[PDB]
Amino acid sequence: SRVAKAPVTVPNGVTVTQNGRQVEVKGSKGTLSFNLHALVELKQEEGKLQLAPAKESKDAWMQAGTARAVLNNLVKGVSEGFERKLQLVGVGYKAAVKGTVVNLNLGYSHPIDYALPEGVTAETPTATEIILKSANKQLLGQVAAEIRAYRSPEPYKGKGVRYSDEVILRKEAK
RNA sequence: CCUCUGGUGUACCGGUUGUGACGCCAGUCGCAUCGCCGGGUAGCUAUGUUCGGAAGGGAUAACCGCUGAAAGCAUCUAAGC
Q1: What is the secondary structure of A38-56 as a DSSP string?
Q2: Which residues touch strand B (CB under 7 A)?
Q3: Tell me, how does this one assemble?
């Protein structure tokens, strides 16, 4: 698989330690861990790493591709990290970051308080935008989805919480 | 469950008709659906009183996902959450 054949690059300050199944990546941003499928083997030569199958099975190639992708994600995350940029649209819709808990007012009869998990930080330049930053792409996406699920966009006006890079289908009555 | 509101309450109290008896008056008792009629203690009881189906964990159904290759893109799935 082309993804597996492609080699991943270690920038410099990040270290990759394989200990049997449980590979670990250390970096400036923090610590991450990744397990390896029984068909996959990893060879680190120079900063570069090679994912290749132990057996020539199609399943082994597929697992090698997914392993290369996840490790590339982990290395990029520890080196630099990611952010999400959620946006809020609607009249009276508001948000604020206080400590580790984000407070939202989305038109219900009670404010919503959402507790950020360990590893993700948030900040709001204004009331209608949220910036989530983290080293873990998967956890960052999960947190963004959970925050968006409190009030999803509607087609008639677009009110609600949306991704910055999100296309929203729109219609009208009659 | 029986404090309250009621029902029943033929061994509790009273009014009264006919007849027989207790020697007689007075006073009582038997029989007449408990003779008929008015009340009513405990117990039982509903139509009376009080209480219950509150809240919370765990795994899931349809459904909605996150990251992610096979298939350089895409994709809730094949690893994983």
Answers
A1: TTEEEEEETTEEEEEESS-
A2: A 1-4, 37, 58-59, 61-63, 65-66, 69-70, 73, 137-138, 141-142, 145, 149
A3: Part of the 50S ribosomal subunit.
